[PDB]
C-alpha cells in the first residue's frame, strides 16, 4: 500500500535513526550520516524499476542485519518510556455534564462558554450529516478522508471529538 518512493524514504529515515543509535557521538554520526546518504544517492536515478526493487529488497536485508538491538526511542513515541504515561489523566469532556450543580457553580464562566460550544455542536450536526451524505459515492466512502466545510458558516463534518479532545498534558 506504500509506493516504492515511500518505502525507500522510510528505510532512509529508519536507517539513520539506528545509525545514530550506534554512533552516539554527534561528530561521529555526522560522518556516517553523510556516507549513508551517499549510498542512497549512488542509485537515486535508477530507472529500471526491477533493478530498483532489488536494490530496496537487498537494503532491507542489510538493515535487518545491522540494526541496533536497542535503538533510541523518543520518550513519548510508541515503545518509549513516557508513552501513554498521561492517559490516566485524560478525562472525556462529557464527564462534565454529570457534575453536581454545586461543582459547576465553582466555574460559572467556564460552564457558560461550554454551553455555547454544545449549542454550536447541536446547530451544526444536521448540516454535517447532510454534507457527508451528498458527497459520498453511492457504494459508500472508499477512503477515510473527510471533507472541509464548503459554505461559509458551516463547520468541517465530524469535528467535535477532534476539536474538544483532551490536552496532551491535561493536568
Amino acid at each position: 500500500y506504500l509506493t516504492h518512493q515511500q518505502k525507500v524514504l522510510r528505510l532512509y529515515k529508519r536507517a539513520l535513526r539506528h545509525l545514530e543509535s550506534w554512533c552516539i557521538h554527534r561528530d561521529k554520526y555526522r560522518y556516517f550520516a553523510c556516507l549513508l546518504r551517499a549510498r542512497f544517492d549512488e542509485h537515486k536515478n535508477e530507472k529500471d524499476m526491477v533493478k530498483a526493487t532489488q536494490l530496496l529488497r537487498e537494503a532491507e536485508e542489510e538493515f535487518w542485519h545491522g540494526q541496533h538491538p536497542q535503538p533510541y526511542i523518543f520518550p513519548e513515541s510508541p515503545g518509549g518510556t513516557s508513552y501513554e504515561r498521561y492517559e490516566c489523566y485524560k478525562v472525556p469532556e462529557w464527564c462534565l455534564d454529570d457534575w453536581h450543580p454545586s461543582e459547576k457553580a465553582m466555574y460559572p464562566d467556564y460552564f457558560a462558554k461550554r454551553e455555547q460550544w454544545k449549542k454550536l455542536r447541536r446547530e451544526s450536526w444536521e448540516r454535517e450529516v447532510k454534507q457527508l451524505q451528498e458527497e459520498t459515492p453511492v457504494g459508500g466512502p472508499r477512503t477515510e478522508a473527510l471533507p472541509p466545510a464548503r459554505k461559509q458558516g458551516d463547520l468541517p463534518p465530524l469535528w467535535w471529538h477532534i476539536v474538544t479532545r483532551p490536552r496532551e498534558r491535561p493536568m
Binding site: 508513552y83 501513554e84 504515561r85 498521561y86 492517559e87 490516566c88 493536568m171
Partner: protein, 55 residues
C-alpha cells in the same frame, strides 16, 4: 495530581516492610511479605493508563 495518594502508598510500602523486618512468627512475616509485594504492584503500575506499566 495524585501526589497525596503517592505518599500514602510509599508510607504503606514502608509499614509493610517494617512488619516484615520485626516479625517474630512466620504468619506475621507473611503479612509483611505479601504486603510489600502488593504495594509494589500498585506503585509499579502508578501510571495505569500505560499498558507497559500494567504489564
Amino acid at each position: 495530581p495524585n501526589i497525596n495518594k503517592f505518599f500514602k502508598y510509599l508510607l504503606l510500602f514502608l509499614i509493610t516492610m517494617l512488619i516484615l523486618v520485626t516479625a517474630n512468627n512466620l504468619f506475621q512475616l507473611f503479612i509483611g511479605w505479601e504486603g510489600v509485594g502488593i504495594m509494589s504492584f500498585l506503585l509499579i503500575g502508578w501510571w495505569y493508563g500505560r499498558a507497559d506499566a500494567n504489564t
